Short mmCIF file of C-alpha atoms and ligand atoms in Angstrom, two decimals:
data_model
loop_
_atom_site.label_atom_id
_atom_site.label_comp_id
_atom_site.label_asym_id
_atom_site.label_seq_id
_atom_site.Cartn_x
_atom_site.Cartn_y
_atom_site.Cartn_z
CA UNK A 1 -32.81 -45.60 -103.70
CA UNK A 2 -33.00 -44.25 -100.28
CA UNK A 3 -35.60 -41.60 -98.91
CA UNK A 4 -35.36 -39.50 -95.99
CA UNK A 5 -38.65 -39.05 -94.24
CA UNK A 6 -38.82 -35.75 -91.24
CA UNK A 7 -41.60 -35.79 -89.59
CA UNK A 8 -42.69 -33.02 -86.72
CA UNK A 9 -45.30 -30.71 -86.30
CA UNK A 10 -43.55 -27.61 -87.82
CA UNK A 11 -45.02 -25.07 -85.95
CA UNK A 12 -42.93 -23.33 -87.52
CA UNK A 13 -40.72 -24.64 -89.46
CA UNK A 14 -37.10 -23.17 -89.61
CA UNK A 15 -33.83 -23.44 -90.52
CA UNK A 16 -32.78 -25.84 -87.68
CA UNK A 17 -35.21 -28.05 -89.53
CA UNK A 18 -34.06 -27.27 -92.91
CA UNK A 19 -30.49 -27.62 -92.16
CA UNK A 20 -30.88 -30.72 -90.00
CA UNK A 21 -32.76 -32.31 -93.10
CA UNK A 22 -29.62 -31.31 -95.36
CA UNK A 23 -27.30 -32.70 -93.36
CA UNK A 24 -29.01 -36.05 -92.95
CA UNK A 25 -29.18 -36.46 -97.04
CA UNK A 26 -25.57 -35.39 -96.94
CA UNK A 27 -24.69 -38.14 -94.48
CA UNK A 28 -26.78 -41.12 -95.55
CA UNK A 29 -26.71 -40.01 -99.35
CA UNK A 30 -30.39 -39.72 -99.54
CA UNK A 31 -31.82 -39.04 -103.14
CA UNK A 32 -35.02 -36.87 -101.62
CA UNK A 33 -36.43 -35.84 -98.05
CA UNK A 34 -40.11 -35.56 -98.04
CA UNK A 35 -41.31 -33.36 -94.91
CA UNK A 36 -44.61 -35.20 -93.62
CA UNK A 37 -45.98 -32.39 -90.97
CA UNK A 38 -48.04 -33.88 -88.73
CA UNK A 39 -52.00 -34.21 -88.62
CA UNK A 40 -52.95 -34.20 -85.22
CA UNK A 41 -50.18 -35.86 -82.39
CA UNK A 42 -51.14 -37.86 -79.84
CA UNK A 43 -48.41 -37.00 -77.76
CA UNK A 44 -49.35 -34.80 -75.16
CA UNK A 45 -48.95 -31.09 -74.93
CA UNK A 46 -49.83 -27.79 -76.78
CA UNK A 47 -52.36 -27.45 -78.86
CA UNK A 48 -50.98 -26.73 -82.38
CA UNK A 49 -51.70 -24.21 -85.46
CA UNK A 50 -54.46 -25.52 -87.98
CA UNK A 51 -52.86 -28.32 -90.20
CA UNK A 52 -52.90 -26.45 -93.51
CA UNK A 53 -51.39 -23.46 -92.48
CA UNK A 54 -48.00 -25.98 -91.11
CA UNK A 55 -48.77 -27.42 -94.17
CA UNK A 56 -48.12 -24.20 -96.37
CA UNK A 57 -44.79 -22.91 -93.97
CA UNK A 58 -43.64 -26.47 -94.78
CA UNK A 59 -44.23 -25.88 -98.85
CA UNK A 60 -42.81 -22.49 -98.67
CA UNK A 61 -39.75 -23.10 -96.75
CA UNK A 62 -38.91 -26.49 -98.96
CA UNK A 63 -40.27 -25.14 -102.30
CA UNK A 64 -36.48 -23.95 -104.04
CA UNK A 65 -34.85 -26.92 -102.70
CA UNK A 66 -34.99 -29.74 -105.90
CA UNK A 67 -34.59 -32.60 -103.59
CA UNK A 68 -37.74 -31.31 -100.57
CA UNK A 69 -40.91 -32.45 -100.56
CA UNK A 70 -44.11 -32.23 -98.49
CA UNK A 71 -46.41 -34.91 -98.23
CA UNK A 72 -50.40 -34.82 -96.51
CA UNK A 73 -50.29 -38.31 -95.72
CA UNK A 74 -50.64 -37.31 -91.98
CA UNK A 75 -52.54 -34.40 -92.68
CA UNK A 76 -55.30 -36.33 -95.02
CA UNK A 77 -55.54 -39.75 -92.66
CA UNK A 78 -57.39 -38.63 -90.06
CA UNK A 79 -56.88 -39.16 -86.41
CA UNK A 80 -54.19 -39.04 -84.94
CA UNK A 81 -51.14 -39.15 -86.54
CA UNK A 82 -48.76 -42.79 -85.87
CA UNK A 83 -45.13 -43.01 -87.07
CA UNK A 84 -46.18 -46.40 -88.15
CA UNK A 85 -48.62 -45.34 -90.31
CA UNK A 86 -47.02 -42.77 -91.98
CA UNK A 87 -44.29 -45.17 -92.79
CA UNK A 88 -46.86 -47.61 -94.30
CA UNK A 89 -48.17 -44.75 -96.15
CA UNK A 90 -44.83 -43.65 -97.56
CA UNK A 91 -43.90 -47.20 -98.26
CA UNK A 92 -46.83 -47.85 -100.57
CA UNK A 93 -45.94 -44.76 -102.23
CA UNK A 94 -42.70 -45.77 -102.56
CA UNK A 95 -42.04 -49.13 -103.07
CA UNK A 96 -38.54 -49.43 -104.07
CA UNK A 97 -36.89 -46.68 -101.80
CA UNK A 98 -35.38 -47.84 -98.27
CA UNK A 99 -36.84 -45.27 -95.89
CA UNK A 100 -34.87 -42.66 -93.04
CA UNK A 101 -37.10 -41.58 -90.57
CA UNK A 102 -35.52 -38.12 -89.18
CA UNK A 103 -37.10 -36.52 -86.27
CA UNK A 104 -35.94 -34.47 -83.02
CA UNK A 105 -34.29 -36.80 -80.79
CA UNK A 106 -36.48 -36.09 -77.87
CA UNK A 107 -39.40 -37.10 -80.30
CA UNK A 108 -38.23 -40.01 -81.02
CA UNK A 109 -37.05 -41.24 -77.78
CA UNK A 110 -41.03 -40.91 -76.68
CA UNK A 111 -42.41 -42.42 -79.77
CA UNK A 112 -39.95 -45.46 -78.83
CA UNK A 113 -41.10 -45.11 -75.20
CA UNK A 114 -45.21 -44.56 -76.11
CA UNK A 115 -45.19 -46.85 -79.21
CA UNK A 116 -42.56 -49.21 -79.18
CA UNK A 117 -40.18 -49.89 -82.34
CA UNK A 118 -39.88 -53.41 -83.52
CA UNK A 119 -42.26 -53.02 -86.01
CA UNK A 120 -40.77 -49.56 -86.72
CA UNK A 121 -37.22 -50.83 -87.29
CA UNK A 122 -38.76 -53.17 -89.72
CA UNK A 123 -40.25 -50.26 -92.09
CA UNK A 124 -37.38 -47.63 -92.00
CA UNK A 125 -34.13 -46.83 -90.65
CA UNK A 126 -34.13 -43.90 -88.00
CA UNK A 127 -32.20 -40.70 -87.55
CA UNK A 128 -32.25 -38.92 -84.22
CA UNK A 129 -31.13 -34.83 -84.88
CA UNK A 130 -30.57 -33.25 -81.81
CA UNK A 131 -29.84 -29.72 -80.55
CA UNK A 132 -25.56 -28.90 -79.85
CA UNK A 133 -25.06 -30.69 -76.22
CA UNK A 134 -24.20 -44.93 -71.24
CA UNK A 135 -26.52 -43.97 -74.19
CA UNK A 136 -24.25 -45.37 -76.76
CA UNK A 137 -24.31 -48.69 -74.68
CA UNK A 138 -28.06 -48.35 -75.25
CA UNK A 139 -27.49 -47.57 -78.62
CA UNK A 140 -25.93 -50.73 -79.20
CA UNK A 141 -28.64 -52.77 -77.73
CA UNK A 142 -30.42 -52.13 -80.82
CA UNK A 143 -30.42 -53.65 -83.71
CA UNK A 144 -27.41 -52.99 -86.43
CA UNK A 145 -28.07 -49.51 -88.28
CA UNK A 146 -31.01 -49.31 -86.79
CA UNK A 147 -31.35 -45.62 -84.91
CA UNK A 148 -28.33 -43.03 -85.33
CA UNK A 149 -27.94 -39.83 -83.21
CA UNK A 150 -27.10 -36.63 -85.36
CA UNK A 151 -26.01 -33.51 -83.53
CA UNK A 152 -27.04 -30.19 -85.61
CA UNK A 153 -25.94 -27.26 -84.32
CA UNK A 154 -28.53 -24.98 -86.19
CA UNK A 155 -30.94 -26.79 -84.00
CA UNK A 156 -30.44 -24.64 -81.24
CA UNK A 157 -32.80 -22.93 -83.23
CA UNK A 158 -35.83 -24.22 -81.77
CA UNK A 159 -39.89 -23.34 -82.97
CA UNK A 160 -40.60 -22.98 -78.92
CA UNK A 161 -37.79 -19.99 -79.38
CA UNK A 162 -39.63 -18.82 -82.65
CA UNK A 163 -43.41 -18.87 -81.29
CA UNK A 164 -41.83 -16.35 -78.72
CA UNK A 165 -40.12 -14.25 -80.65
CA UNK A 166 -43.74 -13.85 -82.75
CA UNK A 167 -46.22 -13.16 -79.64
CA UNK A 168 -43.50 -10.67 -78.34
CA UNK A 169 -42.95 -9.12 -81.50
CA UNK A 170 -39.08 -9.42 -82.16
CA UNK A 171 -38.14 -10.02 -85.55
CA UNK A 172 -37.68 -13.90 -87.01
CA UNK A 173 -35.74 -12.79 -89.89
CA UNK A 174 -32.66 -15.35 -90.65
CA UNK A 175 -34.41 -17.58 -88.33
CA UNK A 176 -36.19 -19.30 -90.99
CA UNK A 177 -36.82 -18.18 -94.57
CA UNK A 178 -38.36 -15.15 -95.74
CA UNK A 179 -41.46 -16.73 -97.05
CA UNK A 180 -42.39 -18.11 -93.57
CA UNK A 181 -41.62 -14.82 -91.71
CA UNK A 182 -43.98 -13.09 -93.28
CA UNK A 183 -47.05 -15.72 -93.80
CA UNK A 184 -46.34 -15.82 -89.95
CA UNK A 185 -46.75 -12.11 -89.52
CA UNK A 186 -49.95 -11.95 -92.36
CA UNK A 187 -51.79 -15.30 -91.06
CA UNK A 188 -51.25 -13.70 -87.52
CA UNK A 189 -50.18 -17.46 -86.28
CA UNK A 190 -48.47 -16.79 -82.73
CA UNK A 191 -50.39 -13.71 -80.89
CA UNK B 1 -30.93 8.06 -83.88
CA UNK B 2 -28.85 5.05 -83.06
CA UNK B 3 -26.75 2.93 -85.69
CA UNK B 4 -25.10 -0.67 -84.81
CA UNK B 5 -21.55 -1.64 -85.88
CA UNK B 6 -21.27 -5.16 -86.13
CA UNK B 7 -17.51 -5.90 -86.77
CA UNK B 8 -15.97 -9.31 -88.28
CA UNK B 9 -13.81 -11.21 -90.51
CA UNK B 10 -17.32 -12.48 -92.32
CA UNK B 11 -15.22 -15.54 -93.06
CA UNK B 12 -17.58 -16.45 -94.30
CA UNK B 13 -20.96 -14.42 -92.79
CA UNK B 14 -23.63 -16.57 -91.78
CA UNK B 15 -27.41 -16.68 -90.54
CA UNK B 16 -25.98 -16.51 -87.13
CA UNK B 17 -24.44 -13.45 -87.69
CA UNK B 18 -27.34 -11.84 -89.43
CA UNK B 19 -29.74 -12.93 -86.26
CA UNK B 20 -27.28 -11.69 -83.99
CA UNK B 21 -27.40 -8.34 -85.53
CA UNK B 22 -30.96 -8.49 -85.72
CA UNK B 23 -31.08 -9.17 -82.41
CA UNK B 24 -28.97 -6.46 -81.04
CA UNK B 25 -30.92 -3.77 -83.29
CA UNK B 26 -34.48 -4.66 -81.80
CA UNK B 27 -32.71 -4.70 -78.19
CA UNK B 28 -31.16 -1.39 -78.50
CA UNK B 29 -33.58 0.08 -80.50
CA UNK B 30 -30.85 0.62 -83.28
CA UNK B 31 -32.14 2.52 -86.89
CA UNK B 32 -29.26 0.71 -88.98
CA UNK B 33 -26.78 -1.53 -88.36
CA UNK B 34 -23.21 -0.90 -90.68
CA UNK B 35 -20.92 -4.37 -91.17
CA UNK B 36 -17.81 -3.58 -91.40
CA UNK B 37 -15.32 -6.35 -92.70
CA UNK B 38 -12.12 -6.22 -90.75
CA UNK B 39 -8.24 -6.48 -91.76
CA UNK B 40 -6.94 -9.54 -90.50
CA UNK B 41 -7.55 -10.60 -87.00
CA UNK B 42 -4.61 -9.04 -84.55
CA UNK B 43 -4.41 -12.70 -82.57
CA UNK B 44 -2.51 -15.08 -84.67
CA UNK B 45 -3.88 -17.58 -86.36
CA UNK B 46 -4.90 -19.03 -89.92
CA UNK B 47 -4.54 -15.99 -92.78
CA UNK B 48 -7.83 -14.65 -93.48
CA UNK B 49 -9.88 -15.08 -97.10
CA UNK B 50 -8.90 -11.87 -99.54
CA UNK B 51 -10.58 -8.87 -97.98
CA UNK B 52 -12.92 -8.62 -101.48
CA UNK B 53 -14.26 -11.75 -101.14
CA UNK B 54 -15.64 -11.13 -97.58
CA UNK B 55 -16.83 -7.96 -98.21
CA UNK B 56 -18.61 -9.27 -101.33
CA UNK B 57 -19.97 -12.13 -99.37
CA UNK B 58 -21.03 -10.12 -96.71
CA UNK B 59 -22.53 -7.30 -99.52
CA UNK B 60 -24.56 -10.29 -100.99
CA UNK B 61 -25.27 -11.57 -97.02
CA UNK B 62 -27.15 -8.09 -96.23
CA UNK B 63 -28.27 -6.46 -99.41
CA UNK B 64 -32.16 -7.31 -98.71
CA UNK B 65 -32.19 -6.28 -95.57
CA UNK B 66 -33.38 -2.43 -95.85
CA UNK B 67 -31.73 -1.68 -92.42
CA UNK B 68 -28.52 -3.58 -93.06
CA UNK B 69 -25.35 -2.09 -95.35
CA UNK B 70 -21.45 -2.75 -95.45
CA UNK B 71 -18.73 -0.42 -95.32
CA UNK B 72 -15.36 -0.25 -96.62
CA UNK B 73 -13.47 1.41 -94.41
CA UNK B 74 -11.25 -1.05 -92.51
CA UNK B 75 -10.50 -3.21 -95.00
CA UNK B 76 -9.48 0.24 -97.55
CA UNK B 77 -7.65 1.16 -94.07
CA UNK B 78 -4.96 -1.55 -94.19
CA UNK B 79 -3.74 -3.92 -91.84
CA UNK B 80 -5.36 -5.29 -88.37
CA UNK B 81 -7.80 -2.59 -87.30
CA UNK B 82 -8.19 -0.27 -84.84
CA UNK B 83 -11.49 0.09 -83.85
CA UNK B 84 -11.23 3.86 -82.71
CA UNK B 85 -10.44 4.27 -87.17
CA UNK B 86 -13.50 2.09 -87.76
CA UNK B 87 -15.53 4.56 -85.27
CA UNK B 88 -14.14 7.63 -86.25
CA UNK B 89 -14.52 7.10 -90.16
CA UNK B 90 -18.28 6.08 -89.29
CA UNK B 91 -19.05 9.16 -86.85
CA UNK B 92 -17.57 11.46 -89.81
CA UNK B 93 -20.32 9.52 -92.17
CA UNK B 94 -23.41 9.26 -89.16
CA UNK B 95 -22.46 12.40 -87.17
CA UNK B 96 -25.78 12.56 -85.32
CA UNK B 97 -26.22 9.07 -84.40
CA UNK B 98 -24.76 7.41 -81.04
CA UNK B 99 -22.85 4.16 -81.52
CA UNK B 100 -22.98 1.14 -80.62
CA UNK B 101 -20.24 -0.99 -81.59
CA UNK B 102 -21.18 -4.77 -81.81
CA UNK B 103 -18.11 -8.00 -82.41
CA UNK B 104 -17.75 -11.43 -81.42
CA UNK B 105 -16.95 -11.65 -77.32
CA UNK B 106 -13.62 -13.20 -78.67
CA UNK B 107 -13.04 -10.37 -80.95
CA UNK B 108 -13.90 -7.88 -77.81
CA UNK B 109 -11.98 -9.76 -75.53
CA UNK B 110 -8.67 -9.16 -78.15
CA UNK B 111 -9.67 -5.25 -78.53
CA UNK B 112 -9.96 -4.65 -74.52
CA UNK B 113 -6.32 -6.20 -74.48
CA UNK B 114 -4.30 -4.68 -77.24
CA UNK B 115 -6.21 -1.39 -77.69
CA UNK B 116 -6.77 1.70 -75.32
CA UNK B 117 -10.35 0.44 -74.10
CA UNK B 118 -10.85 3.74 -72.11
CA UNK B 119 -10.72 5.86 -75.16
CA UNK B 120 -12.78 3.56 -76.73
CA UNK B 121 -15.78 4.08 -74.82
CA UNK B 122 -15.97 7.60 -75.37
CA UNK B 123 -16.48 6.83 -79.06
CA UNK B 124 -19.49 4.16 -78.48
CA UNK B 125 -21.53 1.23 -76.41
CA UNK B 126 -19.86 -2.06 -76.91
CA UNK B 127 -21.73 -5.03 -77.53
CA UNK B 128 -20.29 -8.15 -77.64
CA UNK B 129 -22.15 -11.58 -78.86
CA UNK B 130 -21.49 -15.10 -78.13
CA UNK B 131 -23.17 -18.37 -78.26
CA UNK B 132 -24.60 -19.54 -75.00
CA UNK B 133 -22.09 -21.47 -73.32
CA UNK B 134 -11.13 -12.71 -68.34
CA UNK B 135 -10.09 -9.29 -68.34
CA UNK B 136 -12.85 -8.66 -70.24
CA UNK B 137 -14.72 -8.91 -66.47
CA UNK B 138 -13.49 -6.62 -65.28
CA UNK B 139 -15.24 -3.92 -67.36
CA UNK B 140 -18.33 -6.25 -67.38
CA UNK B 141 -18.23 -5.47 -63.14
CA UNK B 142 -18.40 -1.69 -63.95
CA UNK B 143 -20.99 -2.37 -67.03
CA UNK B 144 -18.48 -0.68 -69.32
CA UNK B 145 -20.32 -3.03 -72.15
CA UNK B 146 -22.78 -5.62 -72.34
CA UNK B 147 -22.56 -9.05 -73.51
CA UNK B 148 -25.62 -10.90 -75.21
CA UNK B 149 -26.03 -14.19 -76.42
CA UNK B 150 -27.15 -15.45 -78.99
CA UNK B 151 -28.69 -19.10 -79.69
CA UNK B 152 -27.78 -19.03 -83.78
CA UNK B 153 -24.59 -18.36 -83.18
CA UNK B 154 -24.06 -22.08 -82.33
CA UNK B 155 -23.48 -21.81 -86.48
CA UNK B 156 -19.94 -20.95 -87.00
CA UNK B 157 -17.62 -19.68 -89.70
CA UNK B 158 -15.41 -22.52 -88.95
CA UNK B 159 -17.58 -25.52 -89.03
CA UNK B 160 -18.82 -23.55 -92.32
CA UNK B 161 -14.87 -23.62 -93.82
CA UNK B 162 -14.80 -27.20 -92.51
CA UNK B 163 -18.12 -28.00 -94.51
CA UNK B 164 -17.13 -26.77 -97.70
CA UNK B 165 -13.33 -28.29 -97.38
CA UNK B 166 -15.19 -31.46 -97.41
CA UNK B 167 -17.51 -30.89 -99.59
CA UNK B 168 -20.48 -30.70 -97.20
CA UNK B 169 -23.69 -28.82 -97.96
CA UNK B 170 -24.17 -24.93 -96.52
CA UNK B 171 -27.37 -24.53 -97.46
CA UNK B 172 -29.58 -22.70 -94.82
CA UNK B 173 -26.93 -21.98 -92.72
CA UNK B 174 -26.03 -18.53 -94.45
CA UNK B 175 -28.22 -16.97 -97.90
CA UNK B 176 -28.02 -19.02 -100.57
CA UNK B 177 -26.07 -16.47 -102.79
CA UNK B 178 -23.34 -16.95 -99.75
CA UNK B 179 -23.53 -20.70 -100.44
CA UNK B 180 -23.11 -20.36 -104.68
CA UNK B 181 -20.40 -17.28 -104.04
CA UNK B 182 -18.52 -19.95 -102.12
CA UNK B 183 -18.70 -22.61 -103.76
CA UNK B 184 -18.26 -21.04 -107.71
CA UNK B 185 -14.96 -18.75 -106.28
CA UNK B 186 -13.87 -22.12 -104.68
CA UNK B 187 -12.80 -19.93 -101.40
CA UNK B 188 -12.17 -22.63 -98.48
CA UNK B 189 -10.94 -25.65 -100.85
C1 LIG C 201 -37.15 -45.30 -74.93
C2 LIG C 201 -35.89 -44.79 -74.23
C3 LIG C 201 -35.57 -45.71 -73.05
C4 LIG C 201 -34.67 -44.65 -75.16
C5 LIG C 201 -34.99 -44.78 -76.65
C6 LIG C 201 -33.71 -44.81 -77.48
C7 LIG C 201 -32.91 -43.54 -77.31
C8 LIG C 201 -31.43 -43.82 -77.04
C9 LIG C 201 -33.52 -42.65 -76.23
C10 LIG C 201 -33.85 -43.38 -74.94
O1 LIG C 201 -34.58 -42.44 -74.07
C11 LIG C 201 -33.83 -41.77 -73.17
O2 LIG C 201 -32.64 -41.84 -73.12
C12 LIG C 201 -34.61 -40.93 -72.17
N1 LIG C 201 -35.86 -40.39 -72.67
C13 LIG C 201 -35.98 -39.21 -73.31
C14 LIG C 201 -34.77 -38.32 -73.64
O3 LIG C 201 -34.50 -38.60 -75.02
C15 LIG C 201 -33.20 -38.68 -75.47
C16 LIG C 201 -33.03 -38.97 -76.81
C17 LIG C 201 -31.76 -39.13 -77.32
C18 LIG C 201 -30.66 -38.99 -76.51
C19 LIG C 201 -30.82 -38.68 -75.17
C20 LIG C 201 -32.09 -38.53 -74.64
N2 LIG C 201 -37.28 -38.96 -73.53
C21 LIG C 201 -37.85 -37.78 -74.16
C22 LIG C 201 -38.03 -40.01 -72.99
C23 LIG C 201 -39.40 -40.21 -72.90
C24 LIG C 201 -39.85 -41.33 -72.20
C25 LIG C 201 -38.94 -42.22 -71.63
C26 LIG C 201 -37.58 -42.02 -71.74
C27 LIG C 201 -37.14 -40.90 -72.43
CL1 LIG C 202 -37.42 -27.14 -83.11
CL1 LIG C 203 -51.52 -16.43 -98.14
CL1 LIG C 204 -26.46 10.67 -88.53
CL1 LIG C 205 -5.90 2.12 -79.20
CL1 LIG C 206 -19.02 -13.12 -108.76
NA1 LIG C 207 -23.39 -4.32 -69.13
#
C-alpha cells in the first residue's frame, strides 16, 4: 500500500496543486494522497493566512475526490512545522503504507538544504513537482528511488499568481475550484 | 456593451481556455464572451473530433458560467471557417455590441495569412492568447491587435488527447463533466 503525502502551505490551494497531486498517484500508483497543510513554517518569508482557514480551502478543494484527504497533523502539533515530523506522524497513522512525500521542487530543495535528508529518505520516498521549465548527475548521487523530479504543467499556476489576482480584484474562476473562489472572496483572505 | 468571441476547435476545452477567456473579459471590460466551435482547422493536420462532441463539451465546459454561452454558427456553417461568417452571424445576433474577437496566437497567425485581415478589422478587435513563451508582426508594429498571455494555457488540448490515449487522469485540468464526457464517449482512444 503506498500513500502520497503533499505538503505546502496552501495559501491557496489550486488546481496546479490538485492536478500535480493526480498526476503523482497516476505515476507511482498511489492508493490515497492526504494533503497535510502546514502549521506554521519555519522557512523564512511571508507571513501566511490563519491555519484553519488553509485548512478549510484544502477540505473544500479535495472533498469530491474519493482518493484526497486532509490531515491536521501539522496544524494540531504545535510549533513549527518539520517534514520529519509530519512523516513520523503519518507513519504512526499508517503503519503498513510506504509513504511519497510530494512538494514544490523549490521546497524541497531548501528543506534538503535547511534540514538535511538522511533521516528523511529513511521515512518516505520523495516527489519533486515543478512548474513547465548537471542536476540529474546530482540526482544520481542519491540514493536509488530516493527523490524524483515531476514537471506539471498546471503548475504554472502558482498561489503567488492567485493572492494577486484577489487583492487586485480579477476573477480566480478556473484557477482553482469554485468552492475556494468564493470562501476566498466571503472570508476576505487576500485584501 | 462589449461581447468576446473566443474561437477554437475545443478539442477538447480546458481550464486554460476558460481562464484565458476570463482573463480577456476583465481586461477589456467585455459583458459576455460567445465560444464558438470552429470547422476544422484550415492548416493541415490531424482530423478534428465530430463537431457535436466539441460543441457539447464545450456547452458542458461553460454552462455555469452566467457570462459564458456557445454558438452554433460555424460549425452549422460547414467547412474551415471564415471568421468574417463567424462575425457577421454574431453582429446580426449582438447588433449593438463592439467585438472583440479572441483565438489561439496560432489560430490568428493562420487567419492573418489565408484570410483578408484588412476587412477583418473593420468587423472587430483581435485578441490573440498564448502561453508565455511572423507576419503576424507586422500588424502587432501598427497595434492592429493585441496579444496576451496567459499562464494556464501551459494546459493543452494535446497533452489532454495524449492523457486520455494513455489512459492518464484529466481531472482538474478541464470541469469534471469534460473529464466523464470524455472518457464515457471514448473520444481520443
Ligand atoms: C540541497 C541542494 C544542493 C539540492 C537538493 C536536491 C535537488 C536536486 C535540489 C538541489 O538544489 C538546487 O539545485 C539549488 N537550490 C534550489 C533550487 O531548487 C531546485 C530544485 C529542483 C531542481 C532545480 C532546482 N533551492 C531552492 C535551494 C535552496 C538552498 C540551496 C540550494 C538550492
Ligand atoms: Cl503554487
Ligand atoms: Cl464559511
Ligand atoms: Cl447587442
Ligand atoms: Cl477573407
Ligand atoms: Cl451524453
Ligand atoms: Na496591440
Amino acid at each position: 500500500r503506498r500513500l502520497g503525502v503533499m505538503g505546502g502551505t496552501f495559501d491557496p490551494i489550486h488546481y496546479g496543486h490538485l492536478v500535480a497531486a493526480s498526476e503523482v498517484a497516476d505515476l507511482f500508483d498511489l492508493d490515497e494522497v492526504v494533503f497535510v497543510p502546514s502549521g506554521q513554517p519555519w522557512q523564512k518569508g511571508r507571513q501566511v493566512s490563519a491555519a484553519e482557514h488553509r485548512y478549510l480551502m484544502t477540505v473544500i478543494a479535495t472533498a469530491s475526490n474519493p482518493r484526497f484527504s486532509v490531515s491536521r497533523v501539522d496544524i494540531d502539533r504545535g510549533g513549527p512545522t518539520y517534514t520529519k515530523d509530519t512523516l513520523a506522524d503519518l507513519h504512526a497513522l499508517h503503519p503498513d503504507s510506504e509513504l511519497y512525500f510530494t512538494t514544490g521542487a523549490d521546497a524541497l530543495a531548501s528543506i534538503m538544504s535547511w534540514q538535511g535528508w538522511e533521516e528523511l529518505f529513511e521515512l518516505a520516498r520523495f516527489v519533486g513537482v515543478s512548474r513547465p521549465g548537471h542536476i540529474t548527475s546530482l540526482l544520481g548521487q542519491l540514493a536509488k528511488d530516493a527523490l524524483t523530479l515531476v514537471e506539471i504543467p498546471a503548475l504554472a499556476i502558482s498561489s503567488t499568481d492567485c493572492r494577486q489576482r484577489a487583492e487586485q480584484s480579477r476573477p480566480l474562476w478556473y484557477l482553482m475550484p469554485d468552492g475556494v473562489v468564493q470562501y476566498v472572496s466571503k472570508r476576505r483572505l487576500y485584501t
